[PDB]
Amino acid sequence: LNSLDKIKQNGVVRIGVFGDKPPFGYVDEKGNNQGYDIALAKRIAKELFGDENKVQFVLVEAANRVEFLKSNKVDIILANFTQTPQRAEQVDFCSPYMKVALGVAVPKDSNITSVEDLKDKTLLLNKGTTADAYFTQNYPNIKTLKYDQNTETFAALMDKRGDALSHDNTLLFAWVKDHPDFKMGIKELGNKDVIAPAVKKGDKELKEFIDNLIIKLGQEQFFHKAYDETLKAHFGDDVKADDVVIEG
The structural domains of the chain, with segments of one domain joined by +, span 1-101+193-248, 102-192
Q: Is 202 helix (H, G, I), strand (E, B) or coil?
A: coil
CATH H-level superfamily of 102-192: Periplasmic binding protein-like II (3.40.190.10)
Q: Which of 29, 2, 189, 231 is nearest to 100 (CA)?
A: 189
Dist CA 167 CA 104 (whole Å): 7
Q: Is 227 helix (H, G, I), strand (E, B) or coil?
A: helix
1-101+193-248 CATH fold: D-Maltodextrin-Binding Protein; domain 2 (3.40.190)
Write the DSSP assignment of 117-183 as a string of letters: GGTTSEEEEETTSHHHHHHHHH-TTSEEEEESSHHHHHHHHHTTSSSEEEEEHHHHHHHHHH-TTEE
Contacts of 237 (CB under 8 A, 6+ apart): none
Phi and psi angles of residue 161, each rounded to the nearest 5 degrees, phi first: -85, -15
Contacts of 155 (CB under 8 A, 6+ apart): none
Task: Say which amino acid occupies 109.
Answer: D
Breaks (C-N over 2.5 A) in the chain follow: none
Length of the chain: 248
Experimental method: X-ray
Dist CA 110 CA 69 (whole Å): 40
Write the DSSP assignment of 106-125 as a string of letters: EETT----SGGGGTTSEEEE
| Domain 1-101+193-248 identical in fold to domain 102-192 | yes
Q: Using omega within 30 degrees of 0 as the cis cutoff, is the peptide bond preceding 140 cis?
A: no
